[PDB]
């Protein structure tokens, strides 16, 4: 086991306000394989200026996915108050074969700050946070969303400049509003931009510290960080699991401008991941300085046959989901 730093000294947790209705929004961004949306580049071979038929793990054509969105939290004047989150922690999904994630999709455009539906602002990219594991159950007061035994946490930190991946037991804390205490509604992470994101000094531990307020980290077997370059470009994240471990994919390190996903880590996680949930984040802004944070989209992977169209430099820029409709199947059979 590994040392992951200090426990929280806080005697209670920040109060968390769940209002699903403010987060129920239809901003559809479905998979378009003709733009190679959500394609994990096939592993073990390279191709160029050619079209192959391939059987791998892909999201299917036209899948709307599940949309998630993070919001600024309550404020009064210049005083951050309760957190503002959707009902994500109780919504435990099934990992199956894994999933890919469309990150920062609506950036640069304008949208709502969620917590105040009339206020609008320029939308900025925000990275998603995940909790994955093999055993789920209830918290003490009946609520779903508690992960047992070792749990894989994927938690961006450093105002979007870092990804932390760690695999430990999550011991719920007992203070007021904590998962093992009174008036528990949901756990969340947060950071406070006034103190945590002043230029030159991004706090690389601000989100972890907030996580550490709801759970004590115990029997941790690893904790990795992955530096992330600050920009506002559309990018894709993927995760799968084999007997060799959990595999993390990103477009960001190889094909930043195209979206092809390449493996950038193998985590030594050998228990089968059967469940995951999205960890709600809330940003402790003051009222005047709220921002809009781009929704992200999570699409499940299935075994599918695709036509993959490799450009000359070797990247996939067009594809066809053979099972999509009759016309696409006609294109597939016409290459055999």
């Amino acid at each position, epitope marked *: *086991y*590994v*040392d*992951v730093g200090p*426990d929280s*000294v*806080k005697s209670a947790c920040i109060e968390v306000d769940i209002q699903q209705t403010f987060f129920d929004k239809t901003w559809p961004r479905p998979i378009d394989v003709s733009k190679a949306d959500g394609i994990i580049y096939p592993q073990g071979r390279t191709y160029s200026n050619i079209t192959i038929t391939y059987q791998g793990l892909f999201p299917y054509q036209g899948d709307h996915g599940d949309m998630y969105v993070y919001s600024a939290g309550h404020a009064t004047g210049t005083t951050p108050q309760k957190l503002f989150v959707a009902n994500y922690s109780q919504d435990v999904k099934q990992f199956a074969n894994g999933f890919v994630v469309r990150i920062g999709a609506a950036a640069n455009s304008t949208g709502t700050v969620i917590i105040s539906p009339s206020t609008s602002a320029t939308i900025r990219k925000i990275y998603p946070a995940f909790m994955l594991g093999s055993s789920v159950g209830n918290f003490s007061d009946g609520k779903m969303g508690r992960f047992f035994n070792h749990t894989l946490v994927l938690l961006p930190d450093g105002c979007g400049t870092l990804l932390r991946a760690f695999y430990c*037991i999550l011991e719920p804390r007992s203070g007021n509003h904590c998962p093992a205490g009174n008036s528990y509604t949901s756990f969340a992470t947060y950071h406070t931009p006034a103190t945590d994101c002043s230029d030159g000094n991004y706090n690389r531990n601000a989100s972890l510290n907030s996580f550490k307020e709801y759970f004590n980290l115990r029997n941790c077997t690893f904790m990795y960080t992955y530096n992330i370059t600050e920009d506002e470009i559309l990018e894709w994240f993927g995760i799968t699991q084999t007997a060799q471990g959990v595999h993390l994919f990103s477009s960001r390190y190889v094909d930043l401008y195209g979206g092809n996903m390449f493996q950038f880590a193998t985590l030594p996680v050998y228990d089968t991941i059967k469940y995951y949930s999205i960890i709600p984040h809330s940003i402790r802004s003051i009222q005047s300085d709220r921002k809009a944070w781009a929704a992200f989209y999570v699409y499940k992977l299935q075994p599918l046959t695709f036509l993959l169209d490799f450009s000359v430099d070797g990247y996939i820029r067009r594809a066809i989901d053979c099972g999509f409709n009759d016309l696409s199947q006609l294109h597939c059979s016409y290459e055999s």
Partner: antibody
Amino acid sequence: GGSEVQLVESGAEVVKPGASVKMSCKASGYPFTSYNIHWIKQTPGQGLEWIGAIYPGNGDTSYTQKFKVKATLTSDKSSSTAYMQLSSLTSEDSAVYFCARYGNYPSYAMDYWGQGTSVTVSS
Amino acid sequence: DIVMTQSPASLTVSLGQRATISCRASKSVSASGYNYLHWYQQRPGQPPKLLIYLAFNLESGVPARFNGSGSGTDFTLNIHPVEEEDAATYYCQHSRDLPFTFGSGTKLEIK
């Protein structure tokens, strides 16, 4: 001789009732902001009483109910020092006060203690 | 809010005999496979020293005559066989949840 990690509390104090006193705890030999500093009151007829603790990374604090008001915990990163200020002093506060470091993994214990600050409140 | 009880208050023991100190918590101090109970030894004019952490682990330099044991709410420190250097006061503390608390202490004297 000496060990690598040391907590060196400030000197001893004699003050009048109603005063306040502010004692320091200067750490050395470890990364100052990854270890919480806890404070403990020791008076002859109560043993050890936990007061509270501070996280030097973001200034967060915790107190036990009997001390939420009497004590105020602060830290300085540059000097690697932790401070405890006691206000509204009565005779019931004459005691030796300790700072100690919580070791994180493993143990989760008070692995290292300062030598104690003697505070006396004479009527 | 866990409260620690130590017994006895003081005890005197002959060289080479066994000393047993008990600690009881008002509420279980067990989670995640640990018992968040620690023992400190304190000599006069000095600060406490950590002896045992997480119920039964000896800190480095602490001889094996100290044996810590127990789980949940009831713990005991045994010293066997006691040497002249073991005259101290022993304190238990839990770290299960905040606020942390210590026991009253047990003063051990040797003949």
